[PDB]
C-alpha cells in the first residue's frame, strides 16, 4: 500500500507556503505497513503537470492526498470536487493567468473526489481539528492539480482514491499581514500536519 | 513583584472559555522572582465587580492582566482603551442585560491601558504569534472589568500596570459551529498561553 | 426569441426574497422583439424540479436566467458551474434536508453555464454595478435549479443558454439582523433588477 | 438654529470619497428653519484641524455632524466615542504617517458623541436604513476630527451636540477592487444622503 502526498512551493509573494514543509515532514513515513511518499509541486501551469505526471507513474501510489494553501480560509477544508477549468485570478510562478481554458480538452467537466471526505471530516472533529467540505477549490493551480490527479485515476486505475486538502495560512504568515489592513484567518502548523495524517490514516482504512 | 491574571467562566452558551485555563494554568507560576497569581472571574455584572475588587485588594498586584474570550477575532489583540458605558449585546450569566449605563458615575469616559502594548505586540510578533491593538474591548464584561482594574489604578495606585487581552476562539469551539452557517477563526490554547506569558514578561521588564 | 427568468420565494426564516420581486418585475417585459417570462420557484427540492421542467416545456426559452438571494455575499455574483449534488446545510421550505445525494442519478458531475459570464460581468462593470464570478452556487436549491435547467438544455436542446445569478441581501433585510450580533452586505433592488436586465441584454445579444 | 455637515476629501489612492459629495449636496439647504452648512475637509493632519477650528468658529454651528468614509463597513455606522490618539495605519494625503501621538496633549482621554446616537439608529432603521453604533472610530483622521470636534464643544460651549458618521464605500468604488482579489460591502450614495439628513432632522429634535 503507497500513499502519494503532495505540496506546493511558496507564492503570491509569500516567503513560505506550509503545504511544502507538510510533504517534506511526512515523505518516507509509514502509517501501518503503508508506505508514504512526499512530493512538492511547482506552482507553475504546465510544469506542475509534467511533476504531478512523473510521479504518480513513478510511485503508483493507491492513494494521492494533495495538500495546498487557502489564503483566507479559517479551518481545514477538504475538497468536494475538481473542475475541468483554469481561471487564475493572479499568475503563476512564472507570469502565465490563465482564463477560461480547459485542463483536459474534451475530458468531463468535473469529477468528485474519491477520498471518504465525509469520515474525514468527522475524523477530523473528534480530535478537535475544524474541519469542513469545500465545494471548490478555486481555478488556479490547486484545484488545477486535483483535477489532474482524479483524471488520471479514472482513466489509468490509480490512484484508487484521490483527494485535496486546503490549510489556512499558519500563525507567522499574519505577522507581515498586520497594519496592511487586515488580519486573516490562521491555523498552526501542528495542527495541519495531523489533520493530513488524520486523512490518510482514514482512507487507508477505507481501503481496507 | 506581584503579578495577576484573570480569566472569565463560560458565557453565551459555550460549554468552555479558554481564558478559564489560562488563568488556571498560569496561578502559582514564578517568572523570575515575579509571583503569578491566576483568578476567574464571573461574567456576570456587579459580581465581577465584587469579585475583581476582593482580588485586588487581597494580592495588591504591581501588575493586572486581565484575560478574555473574543468570539470571532482572529488573532491576539491587546486593548488600548477601557470606556466607562456598559451597553451589553447579550445578557450576562445571570440574565441581566445592561444598556447605556455608566461603569463608575462621574468618573472619566476612558482610561488607557498602562501596559506597554505596543512593545507587547512586537515581541509576540518576533515569537511568531499574529497580534494587533484593538481600540475597543466592547461594552460587556471584558471592557466592565478593564476599565474597573484602570480606575482602581488611578484612584488607589495600584496596580501600577493594568490592561486587558483578548484571545480567538480556540478550535475546539469551532466544531460545533460548522453546519450552523459559518466557521469562525481560531487560535491554538498553546499560542495563547504563550502570549499571556510574553506579555506578562514584558510587562515586568518595563517596571524593571 | 424568448427568455425565462426565474426568483426564489422567501425561505430560511427571511420575509421576503428580493428575487421574487425581480422575476414578477421582469415578467410580461421585452428587450427588443425577444419576450421576457418571469417565474417565482419555491425553495423546496422536487417540487421546485416539476415548477421548472413544466416551465421550461411551457415556455420553451432560448434563454434561461435563474436567479437567487446568497446570504452574506456583497455584489453581484454570476454563477460558473452548477454540480451534481445536494446537501442542504438548512432544511428547504417543506423542512427536508436532503445530504449527500445526486440530482440527476448518472448525469454528469456538472455543467458550466452556458451564459457569457465574462461579457455579462464586463457590461455589468461598465455600468458601475460590481459583479464577480462565482465557483460554486451552493449545494441548496439554487445549485439544484441551475443544475437541471442546465441538464435540460443538454438533453432537450433548450434552453441555448442557461445561468444562474445570485444577489446579496437588499438593505431592508438587514436591519433585523442588527444587534443579532452582525451586519452583513447588501446592495438595493434597483441595482439587483438592473443587473439582471443587463445580464439579459449581452445573452440576447451573444445569440444574435 | 445652525448646522454643519463635513465630509472629507479622497484618500488611500481613492478616485473619490463619497462623504465629500454628501457635504456639498447638504450645503445651504434648511431642515425647519435650521439653515445647514456643508464644509470639505482635507485628510491631512494639522490642516485638517486648521480648516475645522476655523470653520467651527466662523459658523458657531449649534449641531456638528462630521461624516468619513469606512472602507469594508457594510452599513452605515453611528460613531460613539472619540480618542485622544493618532495612530495612522496609513499616511495621510501629505505622507504624514503619525504614530502613538495625543490629538491634545493633557485632554481627556475620550469624549462621547453628544448626538442621540440610538434615536438616529431608531430613526434609520425604521426608513429601512442599515446601521448600528461603531465603538472605534479608528486612529486617524476621522477619529481626529470627531475628537476636536466634541473637545471645542467641552472647551468653547458649541457645537451642543457632535458626532461622526461613517458611510461604506459607494458601489463604483467597488468595481476596481474587484479582481483584485476582493469584494468589499457597498452602499448607495443615495441611502447615504439620506442617512445623513435623517441624523441631522433626529438631532434638531432633539435640541427642540
Redesign the interface.
Given at each position: 500500500m503507497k500513499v502519494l502526498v503532495t505540496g506546493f512551493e511558496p507564492f503570491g509573494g509569500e516567503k513560505i507556503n506550509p503545504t511544502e514543509r507538510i510533504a517534506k515532514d511526512l515523505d518516507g513515513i509509514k502509517i501501518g505497513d503503508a508506505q508514504v511518499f512526499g512530493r512538492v509541486l511547482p506552482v507553475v501551469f504546465g510544469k506542475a503537470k509534467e511533476v504531478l505526471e512523473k510521479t504518480l507513474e513513478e510511485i503508483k501510489p493507491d492513494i494521492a492526498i494533495h495538500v495546498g494553501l487557502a489564503p483566507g480560509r479559517?479551518?481545514i477544508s477538504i475538497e468536494?470536487?475538481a473542475?475541468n477549468?483554469i481561471?487564475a485570478?493572479?499568475p503563476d510562478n512564472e507570469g502565465k493567468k490563465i482564463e477560461?481554458e480547459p485542463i483536459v480538452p474534451g475530458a468531463?467537466?468535473?469529477?468528485?473526489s474519491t477520498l471518504p471526505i465525509?469520515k474525514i471530516m468527522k475524523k477530523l472533529?473528534e480530535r478537535?481539528?475544524?474541519?469542513?467540505?469545500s465545494?471548490?477549490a478555486?481555478?488556479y493551480l490547486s484545484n488545477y492539480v486535483m483535477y489532474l490527479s482524479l483524471h488520471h485515476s479514472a482513466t489509468k486505475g490509480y490512484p484508487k482514491m484521490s483527494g485535496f486538502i486546503h490549510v489556512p495560512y499558519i500563525?507567522?504568515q499574519?505577522?507581515d499581514?498586520?497594519?496592511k489592513?487586515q488580519?486573516?484567518?490562521?491555523?498552526?502548523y501542528?495542527?495541519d500536519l495531523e489533520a493530513v495524517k488524520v486523512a490518510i490514516e482514514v482512507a487507508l482504512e477505507e481501503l481496507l
Open positions: 479559517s479551518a468536494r470536487i473542475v477549468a481561471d485570478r493572479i477560461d468531463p467537466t468535473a469529477y468528485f465525509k472533529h478537535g481539528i475544524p474541519a469542513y467540505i465545494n471548490s478555486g481555478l500563525p507567522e499574519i505577522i499581514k498586520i497594519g489592513g488580519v486573516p484567518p490562521s491555523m498552526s501542528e495542527m
